[PDB]
Design a protein around this ligand. Sequence first.
Ligand SMILES: CCCc1cc(=O)n2nc(NCc3ccc(Cl)cc3)c(C#N)c2[nH]1
Ligand SMILES: CCCc1cc(=O)n2nc(NCc3ccc(Cl)cc3)c(C#N)c2[nH]1
Ligand SMILES: *Cc1c(COP(=O)(O)O)cnc(C)c1O
Ligand SMILES: *Cc1c(COP(=O)(O)O)cnc(C)c1O
Ligand SMILES: [Cl-]
Ligand SMILES: [Cl-]
Ligand SMILES: [Cl-]
Ligand SMILES: [Cl-]
Lengths: 357, 355
Amino acid sequence: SSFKAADLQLEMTQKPHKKPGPLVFGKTFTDHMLMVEWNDKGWGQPRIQPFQNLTLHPASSSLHYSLQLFEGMKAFKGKDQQVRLFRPWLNMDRMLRSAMRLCLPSFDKLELLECIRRLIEVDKDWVPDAAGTSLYVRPVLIGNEPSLGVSQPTRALLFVILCPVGAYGSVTPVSLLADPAFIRAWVGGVGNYKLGGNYGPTVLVQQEALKRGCEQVLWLYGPDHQLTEVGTMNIFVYWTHEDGVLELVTPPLNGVILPGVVRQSLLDMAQTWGEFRVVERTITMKQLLRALEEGRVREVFGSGTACQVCPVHRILYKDRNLHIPTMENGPELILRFQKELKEIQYGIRAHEWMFPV
Amino acid sequence: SSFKAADLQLEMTQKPHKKPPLVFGKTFTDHMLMVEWNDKGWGQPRIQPFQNLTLHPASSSLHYSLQLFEGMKAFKGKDQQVRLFRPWLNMDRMLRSAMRLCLPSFDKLELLECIRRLIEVDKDWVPDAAGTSLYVRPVLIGNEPSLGVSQPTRALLFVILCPVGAYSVTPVSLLADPAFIRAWVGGVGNYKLGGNYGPTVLVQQEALKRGCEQVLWLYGPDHQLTEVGTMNIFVYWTHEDGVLELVTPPLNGVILPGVVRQSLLDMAQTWGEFRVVERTITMKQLLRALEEGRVREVFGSGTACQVCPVHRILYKDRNLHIPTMENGPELILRFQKELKEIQYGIRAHEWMFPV
Ligand SMILES: CCCc1cc(=O)n2nc(NCc3ccc(Cl)cc3)c(C#N)c2[nH]1
Ligand SMILES: CCCc1cc(=O)n2nc(NCc3ccc(Cl)cc3)c(C#N)c2[nH]1
Ligand SMILES: *Cc1c(COP(=O)(O)O)cnc(C)c1O
Ligand SMILES: *Cc1c(COP(=O)(O)O)cnc(C)c1O
Ligand SMILES: [Cl-]
Ligand SMILES: [Cl-]
Ligand SMILES: [Cl-]
Ligand SMILES: [Cl-]
């Protein structure tokens, strides 16, 4: 029933744009896009087409009832000009889970991956090769039922667009607002899926953080103020735990955590090293407060595709500014992660995580 | 800064559609309202032929759900006068929604007049059979062509219209499973935002699979009854203190403040015949009240279906008969009678806004 890469239709652009000569994340797009339509006849043939507007019926359920989901992954170009995607199978898996949660049509993950490979191959010259640059890949699946009844759509659109990017200077630390009034996601909810509806409501919360002199939001959960995420990034703490053991901890996948690809990759790398405990456990502000008083915290940071690994130096909680000594500790773990990831992403070391285009 | 109705651009259709049993939200009228917002502020509002939207693939409406909507009804009286039901409350709510998603503010009375003009142009689409109306669907979306999660510098406000029939005293069954969560305290379930709806589609499919028609949304360790489908919930009973009462859950974060809900509270409070309260309702209380024969009627309220009775609730594996229909339903019938008198201009009333 899935659309097939074997049926890919291609229309080259006749309005090719000049590439960037200052890359602002997510604002510059390449010449082509993928588009696939689904209706009562199933999936149509996939097509690579020139970058262009979507035409939607004004009642489209994508716009009224948020039948929408997305992905985000990067492709990187090595010195030899070979382009490789970073662990894209995980994004495909996550995308399909999102689709099922929103009653959107199923597709074949490898068929989509091949279509995306073909699209990036067409726009290969858009993938920059300067240090710290990449191509951001944005798949999207939206419902497209022209009806105001809240219902499973009988029509949908799957499309993929591409953006050359730089950093989002990838080792500049940030300050976080930690206010329990704002709740990103709830157990039994959809916070662990990459659905559009999870993001729009955060915009005002981010504005409030800025107003309070902070740069990003630390999302707290539950009566014990668990640290869940930071902005649109997973949170990690490298510390000596209350039992005396040095560990890297991140919250477990209990429903309010988006299971990041970078997150998983950091756990995977640190487990492979075998040099300290690597654990998924709830982290509370009580534990962090005590650990900071007792000098046991080394580094705190967010993980995610767009910004990679970002250090945190301050947390504002219950009107008090908590200094986080991440930069004082190197930040050694952060720098090590960034170096090993860069070697893999740009092909300095062969690795099964990279998917060649 | 707001767009002004005085600046309205009118483009009449050259291809009118053939007019219509009306199925909710699937038939559209000939025209729509469109207004764009960008760095220069609001453009001039426009009434134009119903037509597709053209959106940049990076539009923040489609990636980060920078989208909200409204729903309200216009009614045509016997003499063809068309009137909107309490539209000021929808404009108020729409603006609260806009602020919550960092979308641009607009002047509520300017939008109302633009909407009046649109309905006037499409006045012949407003049906006048008993139980029929015109459903008005305003929408505001962010339209920033950027993958950054940020306040948009572009937005689009549009309004489409649907003639509708019934949706009106046929009772429904509800699935009440605490696994399902519509909204949480500290969330945005109390705003009419697109994001609150998409996740419910799968849950509604589970309700159907279990032989029920709609979802009774439970919340909290005490299994509070919050909402029913996309409708507010009311219970008419004799409470544990022996007092006859109409109760609906309070606006404490997980309840969408319905216009019909407020109207029912206003109406019953004005009668002064029984106690009318906003208080949480738990399954424990309902189970006990059912066993003691204290429950008279349970129903949902909302624009598309008005007031709908409930006759059954499946609470996990236990099937509960709700005696609404054996009790008249006297309250539901009275509310429906009085609202009809007001909506269709039988009785002049400040709740109605003439077109
Ligand atoms: C939703 C995926 C695309 C995307 C949008 C966006 O706005 N951001 N912002 C990010 N990082 C901001 C940030 C910096 C430091 C900390 Cl500790 C937390 C958040 C990311 C990423 N990655 C991202 N992605
Ligand atoms: C979200 C606004 C438009 C809209 C869509 C939709 O699907 N519905 N469904 C409704 N009612 C179903 C229902 C019937 C009985 C009970 Cl007890 C609960 C829900 C309504 C309405 N009103 C509506 N509106
Ligand atoms: C996308 C996302 C992440 C993790 O992203 P990866 O790029 O898969 O590592 C974490 N949290 C939130 C809220 C996200 O949207
Ligand atoms: C719109 C809405 C209501 C109330 O609707 P009114 O038509 O304003 O009475 C109640 N609950 C939910 C979930 C809604 O979307
Ligand atoms: Cl992998
Ligand atoms: Cl998960
Ligand atoms: Cl009013
Ligand atoms: Cl409210």
